[PDB]
């Protein structure tokens, strides 16, 4: 049946989803997720979008401000809007699945509402493709692939140049923060290949 | 995060073995989510962070996959030129270009709402400003505009059935992530995936560049450039956040280096120790690396050289001999609080003293503080993440390597002093510090072990559970937040693939309104502690035979 989604959990509660098309497959995924981790996912949504102060108060305002200053939601929505129907079905189905359970939770809260919601004083709302996308974007991209300390680095080099002079300071910066170290143990052995690009390490952009 | 993939040439009783240990910190409920998908072109099983549509750790019965952070430099800072007149604009390519901006209002529980403005240029969102020289810094990510493509690449890669189809998806993953491959035929592979900028000639990726236009990236480097290997001569693929490839540059983070001293060597020596490994032995590498002090191997030779000429009764020589007998593998005493050996405490105190005497002394304040951590610092709750060789320690290592180090020592960290003298003085501090605390009988030193805590706040520091849901594990283990292993063509099984993972505390974070915890709320927590694991099912037969519950939904879009 094209409309049928089967959910089978093993003896560790791990869900396996069986469905024919994409929207149904990820609808089933979001369903079981909303069953297992609703509160965690709600708080992750708020973390990745900077809406934590809404429910936890003043101490998270700085946090919320920082999250929003670190990305551009319109750009994310634009990428979602460009997705093929097939790729969109992933996010939409996933979002619809959660909502199917969230609706059931908010209809019979006295038995289905995760305790934490009562404790933290609020209830879950529905998700859209954007929310699902931002879970990934805020927890893998904006936090796990968004690293740089260039402003400090320039400050260190500047302090090293003042202390040891221009040439010596540049050379010591190359000693504390080298661009490459050929003795670095590598996942790929040298016999396999090496990296062809060599970058400038004299700060010639000044 | 660590990962080792054992290929056909080194697998025993199997063709390929993949053991992944992603390190995200520890959390309750579990950081990752177990999930099996069967339909719409998918047939997979495994677990994944925050239940992303795409499983970061799993397999489809034909290939398996995994990840660890790439730590390439995919982020540069552009210094935008501003003007007191025409606020909100910045000079780019000879013209004053209008910045992008948006209003944001932070609603606040039991507080006042706050609205502010976020700014963006062609280079990225604005960090800090500075209306003295009128400069604002824009953070430029090579993956900008590719967030969703990376999310979809992580999903579609699950459908691959060989190296070619898989690398096709790896090419679309724009974040800086190491991807790993293994399959039923014994093949294995690695790709340092990610979008990387094609920088102008002379652009030092460690320092900011002008945003006036002349330093704009030429574009992005092609997939050809991404470090990759398929069926390496070595017969294995091991990573623990170390360099992908010879001459490949690391992240610009001052606190992050790939150098001669790298924790990944701990995995290498265990995989190279034996010609072939079985599934259980490859798994056992988790336990071993979990307990392995990462500094003993790096500095013991220097410690030995410096104390080789001291007499029996010299205390400092006694401390080095203590370390010499030690295999660096920490184990708990029956008290479940202390370590059987004082090795790490000795190294910790010594190393801290060395850094203070060497790297820290040579660096102008307050930057000097950047190189003072020994890498053992922790709280009563234990490390928030993995243990690693500290940046200061890595610099020190190059210094004690002498000429065997390829890094020019522009300045002598030892300030003209004999290296032995400084090493000895630090051992003197170590003995004074430790003996005064534990007594002069080293053999009964019961030094505190690190503990581990599954935290109720997620990595952001935001509650994802109530405070009481936090779980404690006596023994800190420098291992993945979760561990999964896929074994292809196991010779003792009827199936062409076997897989295991551990998702602690458990699959479920649900607590009913009356406080009744779900049956799978904590049924993997002890298993995690004991280095145990549970089977991941893929086929309809295995899933059915192991079903506890079932449900069928009928829905149309
Ligand atoms: C910026 C980082 C997220 S990268 C590093 C480490 N992450 C890993 O070891 C593995 C990993 C990260 C993201 C996705 C998969 C694996 C981890 O934790 N680190 C963080 C840090 O430096 O504060
Ligand atoms: Ca950079």
Pairing mode of beta strands B188-193, B228-230: antiparallel
Q: Which residues are CB-neighbours of A90 under 8 A, at least 6 positions away? A: A22, A26, B53, B152, B155
Distance CA B507, CA B517 (A): 12
Pairing mode of beta strands B338-339, B209-210: unpaired
- Contact present, B501 and B34 (Cβ < 8 Å): yes
Measure A84 CA to nearest chain B CA, in Å.
Answer: 11
Q: What would the two tokens of residue B513 be?
A: 């309104």
Distance CA B55, CA B68 (A): 13
- Contact present, B43 and B37 (Cβ < 8 Å): yes
Pairing mode of beta strands B75-81, B209-210: parallel
Distance CA A58, CA A55 (A): 9
CA of B23 from ligand 1 middle (Å) equals 7
Distance CA B51, CA B403 (A): 49
Length of chain A: 206
Distance CA B69, CA B72 (A): 9
3-state secondary structure of B13: coil
- Cβ neighbours of B552 in A, within 8 Å: 4-7
Block residue for tokens 């054992």: B6
Beta-bridge mates of residue B197: B220
How was this structure obtained? X-ray
Q: What would the two tokens of residue B102 be?
A: 């948006």
Q: Which residues are CB-neighbours of B493 under 8 A, at least 6 positions away? A: none
User: What are the backbone angles phi and psi of residue B97, rounded to the nearest 5°?
Assistant: -90, 140
Q: Which residues are CB-neighbours of A12 under 8 A, at least 6 positions away? A: B34, B503, B506, B507, B520, B523, B524, B534
* Per-residue b or e along B514-525, where b marks 16 or more CB atoms closer than 10 Å to that residue's CB: eeebbbbbbbbb
Environment class of B457 (CB within 10 Å of its CB; exposed 0-12, middle 13-18, buried 19+): middle
**B205 labelled as ligand-binding?**
yes
Q: What would the two tokens of residue B415 be?
A: 């300030």
CA of A135 from ligand 2 middle (Å) equals 25
- Radius of gyration for the alpha carbons in chain A, expressed in angstroms and rounded: 24
**Of the candidates B328, B449, B333, which has an alpha carbon nearest to the alpha carbon of residue B382?**
B449
How many CB atoms sit inside 10 A of residue A118's CB? 14
The DSSP annotation for B500-514 comes to EEE-SS-S---B-TT
- Cβ neighbours of B104 in A, within 8 Å: 50, 65, 68
**Of the candidates B451, B462, B431, B318, which has an alpha carbon nearest to the alpha carbon of residue B378?**
B451
| Inter-CA distances, B209 with A151, B136, B139, B340, B503, Å | 10, 12, 11, 52, 44
Q: What would the two tokens of residue B460 be?
A: 């952001």
- Radius of gyration for the alpha carbons in chain B, expressed in angstroms and rounded: 26
* Per-residue b or e along B539-548, where b marks 16 or more CB atoms closer than 10 Å to that residue's CB: eeebbeebee
Q: What would the two tokens of residue A165 be?
A: 């002079």
- Contact present, B57 and A40 (Cβ < 8 Å): no
**A110 labelled as ligand-binding?**
no
Degrees, nearest 5: CA angle A169-A175-A180: 125
- What superfamily in CATH does domain B291-451 come from? Aminohydrolase, alpha-helical knob region (1.10.1400.10)
Nearest to B242 among A133, A178, A185 (CB): A185
**Of the candidates A65, A55, A9, which has an alpha carbon nearest to the alpha carbon of residue A32?**
A9
CATH code, residues B73-145: 2.30.120.10
Length of chain B: 557
- Contact present, A95 and B53 (Cβ < 8 Å): no
Q: Nearest residue CA, atom 21 of ligand 1?
A: A144
Nearest to A76 among B147, B234, B254 (CB): B147
Distance CA A103, CA B343 (A): 56
Chain A nearest-CA residue for B27: A40
E strands within B155-267?
Answer: 177-183, 188-193, 197-198, 209-210, 219-220, 228-230, 236-239
How many CB atoms sit inside 10 A of residue B403's CB? 6
Ligand 1 atom, smallest distance to B25 CA = 18
**Of the candidates B125, B18, B405, which has an alpha carbon nearest to the alpha carbon of residue A148?**
B125
- Contact present, B507 and B32 (Cβ < 8 Å): no
Distance CA B414, CA B306 (A): 14
- Contact present, A140 and B68 (Cβ < 8 Å): no
Q: Is B384 in the pocket of ligand 1 (CB under 6 A)?
A: no
* Partner-chain contact B114 A70, CB within 8 Å: no
Block residue for tokens 């203070």: B356
A:26-85 residues touching chain B, CB 8 A cutoff: 26-29, 31-33, 35-41, 43-44, 46-47, 50-58, 60-61, 63-65, 68-72, 74-76, 79-80, 83
- Cβ neighbours of A196 in B, within 8 Å: 225
Q: What would the two tokens of residue A35 be?
A: 């069953």
Distance CA A17, CA A31 (A): 10
- Contact present, A194 and B246 (Cβ < 8 Å): yes
Distance CA A192, CA B4 (A): 17
The helix-helix angle for B315-325 and B419-438 (nearest 10°) equals 90
Q: What would the two tokens of residue B158 be?
A: 């699950």
Top CATH class, B1-72+146-290+452-536: alpha beta
**Of the candidates B492, B494, B499, B496, which has an alpha carbon nearest to the alpha carbon of residue B536?**
B499
**Of the candidates A149, A151, A172, A150, which has an alpha carbon nearest to the alpha carbon of residue B363?**
A172
User: What are the backbone angles phi and psi of residue B526, rounded to the nearest 5°?
Assistant: -80, -35
Give the number of C-alpha atoms closer than 13 A to the C-alpha of residue B275, restricted to the C-beta side.
Answer: 1
User: What are the backbone angles phi and psi of residue A132, rounded to the nearest 5°?
Assistant: -60, -45
- Contact present, B183 and B64 (Cβ < 8 Å): yes
- Contact present, A140 and B49 (Cβ < 8 Å): yes
Degrees, nearest 5: CA angle B350-B352-B355: 110
Environment class of B101 (CB within 10 Å of its CB; exposed 0-12, middle 13-18, buried 19+): exposed
Q: Which residues are CB-neighbours of B204 under 8 A, at least 6 positions away? A: A179, A199, A200, A201, A202, A203, A204, A205
| Inter-CA distances, A186 with B228, B249, B250, B553, Å | 12, 11, 12, 49
How many CB atoms sit inside 10 A of residue A142's CB? 18
| Dihedral sign from CA coordinates of B296, B297, B298, B299 | positive
Distance CA B446, CA B399 (A): 32
How many CB atoms sit inside 10 A of residue B128's CB? 8
Q: Which ligand is nearest to the CA of B142?
A: 2
Domain boundaries, chain B: 1-72+146-290+452-536, 73-145, 291-451
Q: What is the structure's resolution, reported in angstroms to one decimal?
A: 2.2
- Contact present, B148 and B162 (Cβ < 8 Å): no
Q: What would the two tokens of residue B352 be?
A: 């801290």
Distance CA A7, CA B34 (A): 13
Residue B380 DSSP label: T
Q: Which ligand is nearest to the CA of B388?
A: 1
Judge whether A130 is closer than 8 Å to chain B, CB to CB. no
Domains (range + CATH), chain A = 1-147 (1.10.439.10), 148-177 (1.10.287.150)
Block residue for tokens 């029996």: B312
A:173-202 residues touching chain B, CB 8 A cutoff: 174-202
- The sheet carrying B100-106 orders its strands as B100-106, B114-121, B124-125
Q: What would the two tokens of residue B534 be?
A: 């549970």
Q: Which residues are CB-neighbours of B95 under 8 A, at least 6 positions away? A: none
- Cβ neighbours of A55 in B, within 8 Å: 109
First CA to last CA distance, chain B: 40
Residue B402 region by backbone torsions, left for phi larger than 0, else alpha for psi between -120 and 50, else beta: left
Environment class of A109 (CB within 10 Å of its CB; exposed 0-12, middle 13-18, buried 19+): middle
Calculated CA dihedral for residues B367, B369, B371, B373, nearest 10 degrees: -160
Q: Which residues are CB-neighbours of B222 under 8 A, at least 6 positions away? A: none
Q: What would the two tokens of residue B81 be?
A: 């030129």
Distance CA B119, CA B100 (A): 6
Q: Is B391 in the pocket of ligand 1 (CB under 6 A)?
A: no
How many CB atoms sit inside 10 A of residue B235's CB? 18
Q: What would the two tokens of residue A15 be?
A: 């869900």
**Of the candidates B109, B105, B108, which has an alpha carbon nearest to the alpha carbon of residue B117?**
B105
């Amino acid at each position: 049946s094209s409309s049928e989604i089967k959910i089978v959990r093993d003896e560790y509660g791990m869900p396996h989803i069986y469905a024919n098309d994409t929207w149904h497959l990820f609808y089933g995924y979001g369903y079981v997720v909303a069953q297992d981790r609703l509160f965690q996912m709600e708080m992750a949504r708020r973390s990745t979008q900077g809406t934590v102060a809404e429910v936890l108060g003043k101490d998270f305002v700085k946090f919320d401000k920082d999250i929003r200053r670190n990305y551009w939601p319109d750009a994310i929505r634009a990428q979602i809007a460009a997705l093929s129907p097939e790729d969109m079905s992933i996010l939409q189905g996933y979002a619809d699945g959660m909502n199917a359970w969230i609706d059931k939770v908010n209809t019979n809260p006295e038995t289905l509402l995760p305790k934490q919601f009562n404790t933290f004083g609020f209830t879950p709302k529905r998700w859209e493709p954007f929310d699902v996308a931002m879970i990934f974007v805020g927890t893998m991209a904006n936090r796990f692939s968004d690293s740089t300390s260039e402003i400090d680095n320039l400050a260190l080099l500047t302090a090293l140049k003042d202390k040891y002079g221009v040439s010596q300071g540049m050379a010591v910066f190359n000693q504390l923060k080298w661009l490459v170290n050929p003795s670095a143990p590598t996942t790929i052995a040298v016999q396999e290949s090496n990296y062809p690009l060599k970058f400038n390490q004299q700060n010639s952009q000044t | 995060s660590n990962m080792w993939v054992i290929g056909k040439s080194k697998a025993q009783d199997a063709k390929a073995i993949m053991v992944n240990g992603p390190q995200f910190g520890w959390y309750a409920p579990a950081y990752t989510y177990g999930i099996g998908l069967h339909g719409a072109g998918y047939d997979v099983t495994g677990n994944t962070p925050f239940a992303y549509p795409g499983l970061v750790f799993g397999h489809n019965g034909v290939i398996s996959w995994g990840s660890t952070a790439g730590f390439g430099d995919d982020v540069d800072i552009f210094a935008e030129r501003l003007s007191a007149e025409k606020p909100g604009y910045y000079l780019h390519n000879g013209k004053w270009v209008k910045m992008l901006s948006r209003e944001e209002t932070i609603t606040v529980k039991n507080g006042q709402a706050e609205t502010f403005t976020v700014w963006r240029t062609v280079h990225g969102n604005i960090l800090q400003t500075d209306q003295t020289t009128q400069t604002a810094y824009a953070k430029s990510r090579a993956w900008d505009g590719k967030e969703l493509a990376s999310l979809l690449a992580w999903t579609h890669q699950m459908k691959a059935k060989n190296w070619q189809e898989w690398t096709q998806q790896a090419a679309k993953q724009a974040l800086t992530i190491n991807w790993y491959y293994a399959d039923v035929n014994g093949n294995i592979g690695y790709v340092h995936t990610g979008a990387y900028p094609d920088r102008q000639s002379g652009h030092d990726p460690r320092l900011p560049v002008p945003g006036t236009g002349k330093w704009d990236w030429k574009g992005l480097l092609p997939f050809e450039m991404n470090p990759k290997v398929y069926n390496p001569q070595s017969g294995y693929i091991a990573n623990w956040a170390n360099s992908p490839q010879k001459d490949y540059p690391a992240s610009d983070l001052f606190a992050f280096l790939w150098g001669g001293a790298d924790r990944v060597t701990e995995i290498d020596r265990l995989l190279e120790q034996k010609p072939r490994l079985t599934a259980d032995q490859a798994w056992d590498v988790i336990r071993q690396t979990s307990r392995q002090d990462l500094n003993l191997r790096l500095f013991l030779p220097t410690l030995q050289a410096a104390t080789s000429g001291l007499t029996q009764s010299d205390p400092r020589r006694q401390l080095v001999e203590t370390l010499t007998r030690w295999d660096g593998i920490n184990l708990l005493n029956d008290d479940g609080k202390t370590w059987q050996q004082p090795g790490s405490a000795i190294l910790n105190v010594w190393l801290t003293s060395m850094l203070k005497r060497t790297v820290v002394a040579a660096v102008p304040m307050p930057f000097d503080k950047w190189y003072s951590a020994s890498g053992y610092e922790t709280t009563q709750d234990g490390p928030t993440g993995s243990l690693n060789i500290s940046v200061g320690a890595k610099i020190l290592y190059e210094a004690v390597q002498g000429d065997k180090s390829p890094i020019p020592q522009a300045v002598d960290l030892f300030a003209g002093k004999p290296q032995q003298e400084v090493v000895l003085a630090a051992l003197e501090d170590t003995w004074e510090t430790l003996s005064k605390r534990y007594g002069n009988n080293v053999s009964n030193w019961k030094t505190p072990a690190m503990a581990l805590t599954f935290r109720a706040n997620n990595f952001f520091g935001v509650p994802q559970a109530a405070a009481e849901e936090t779980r404690h594990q006596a023994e800190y283990q420098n291992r993945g937040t979760e561990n999964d292993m896929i074994v292809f063509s196991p010779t003792t099984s009827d199936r062409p693939v076997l897989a295991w993972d551990v998702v602690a505390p458990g699959q479920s974070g649900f607590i009913a309104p009356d406080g009744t915890v779900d049956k799978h709320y904590e049924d993997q927590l002890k298993m995690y502690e004991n280095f145990g694991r549970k089977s991941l099912w893929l086929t309809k037969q295995d899933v059915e035979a192991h079903k506890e519950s079932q449900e069928v939904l009928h829905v149309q879009r």
